């Protein structure tokens, strides 16, 4: 069985630039390779097959090359619809394995997150629960860390986080951080603080509130 090693796993670039994605087979696949593009979970779309033949409707700025065990997809003068994930797929012998994929994202200027903190709602409090929510919206680059503090002390348990994919409109990222507590637990403390650590600042970017106010 032949496996495909695709690289790089992640790539960042801007409209107008050129990028190259490569795939290497563990055994000769004699040009039996296809390249696919996938947008936010949707059905993958064929770009090139047989290593170098462009599929119908595929812009000529896309081109595949290689032979034996080494192949690559070249994309020059990137267009905004070119950002997403790419996968190579050999079909020389079963199993027709896929490469691990390459995530191509938009490169833009750094942006500090806009932080918003939200105390538990009265409805949830009445039901006995207390979720404190923190939004870290529209920042770039994607790497970021969140740290919660209750009465000045860091809290680590009860925290669940989620991250959006790059925004198709402003190319930024967003993150939500939720600290779930019981009503009693939540009312045993006063100050709740959400702190983000991002490259846009050597200091924490914070937002907090006092249960009393």
């Amino acid at each position: 069985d032949i496996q495909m090693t695709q690289s790089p796993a992640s790539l960042s670039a801007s409209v107008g630039e050129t990028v190259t994605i490569t795939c290497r087979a563990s055994g000769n696949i004699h040009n039996y390779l296809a390249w696919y593009q996938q947008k936010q979970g949707k059905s993958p779309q064929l770009l090139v097959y047989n290593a170098k033949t462009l599929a119908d409707g595929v812009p000529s700025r896309f081109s595949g090359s290689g032979s034996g065990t080494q192949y690559s997809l070249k994309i020059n003068s990137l267009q905004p619809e070119d950002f997403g994930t790419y996968y190579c797929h050999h079909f020389w012998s079963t199993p027709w394995t896929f490469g691990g994929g390459t995530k191509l994202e938009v490169k833009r200027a750094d942006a500090a997150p806009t932080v918003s903190i939200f105390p538990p709602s009265s409805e949830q409090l009445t039901s006995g629960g207390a979720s404190v929510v923190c939004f870290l919206n529209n920042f770039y680059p994607k790497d970021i860390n969140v740290k919660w503090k209750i009465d000045g002390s860091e809290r680590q348990n009860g925290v669940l986080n989620s991250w959006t994919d790059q925004d198709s409109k402003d190319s930024t990222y967003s993150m939500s951080s939720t600290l779930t507590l019981t009503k009693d637990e939540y009312e045993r403390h006063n100050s709740y603080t959400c702190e983000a650590t991002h490259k846009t600042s050597t200091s924490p970017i914070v937002k907090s509130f006092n249960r009393n106010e």
């Binding site: 779309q45 896929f98 806009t114 929510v133 919206n137 959006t164 993150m175 939720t178 106010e213």
Partner: protein, 206 residues
């Protein structure tokens, strides 16, 4: 144009069986394949079916519990379902100068009982103000969230749900001018098709 349509979302329990159909507008012409994609993961080839010889070929990890059939409609049958089969399944074929993939079919395999979400308003403790809605404890995925029945679409993004003890939770963020809220009402609409549920939560200032 050649179009492959797949059957709707599936919800099953560990150990059960599921059949996913793939119906082509036309059609035996060249053979087809099925592909699996686990949440947030890459594409994984399940196998392909030589529509000519009727002979199928499966990838190691799928032999035994996954079977291809054809009746024109193509089928993917999975028995002895495990939680790990939770993913989106695609059927695909090819011909001429291209390939044709179906829209995909999502499958969720879990012991969890379909449970509607509890929706909570997220209001502030500037010229702009960010509001939100917490959608907690629902199963299975997904839920659709809109603001003011879709009238409020700009400055909006809904975070992916996280799974906490068989149940999913997510939140949605919306940013509007302070001159709009609370003067004008802002409401999030949450729909959970699996339980045929629809909930509206007005964002009221503290």
């Amino acid at each position: 144009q050649i179009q492959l349509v797949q059957s709707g979302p599936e919800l099953k329990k560990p150990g059960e069986t599921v059949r996913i159909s793939c119906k082509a507008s036309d059609y035996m012409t060249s053979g087809m394949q099925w592909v699996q994609q686990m949440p947030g993961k890459g594409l994984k080839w399940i196998g392909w079916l030589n529509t000519q010889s009727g002979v199928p070929e499966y990838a190691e990890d799928f032999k035994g519990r996954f079977a291809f059939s054809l009746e024109t409609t193509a089928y993917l049958q999975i028995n002895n379902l495990k939680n790990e089969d939770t993913a989106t399944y695609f059927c695909a074929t090819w011909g001429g100068n291209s390939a044709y993939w179906g829209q995909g079919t999502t499958l969720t395999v879990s012991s969890a009982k379909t449970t509607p979400p509890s929706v909570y308003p997220l209001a502030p403790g500037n010229s702009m103000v960010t509001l939100g809605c917490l959608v907690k404890g629902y199963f299975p995925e997904p839920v659709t969230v809109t603001w003011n029945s879709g009238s409020l679409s700009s400055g909006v993004h809904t975070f992916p749900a996280v799974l906490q003890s068989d149940l999913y939770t997510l939140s949605s963020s919306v940013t509007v001018p302070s001159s709009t809220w609370p003067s004008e009402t802002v409401t999030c609409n949450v729909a959970h098709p699996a339980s045929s549920t629809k909930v509206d939560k007005k964002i009221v200032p503290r």
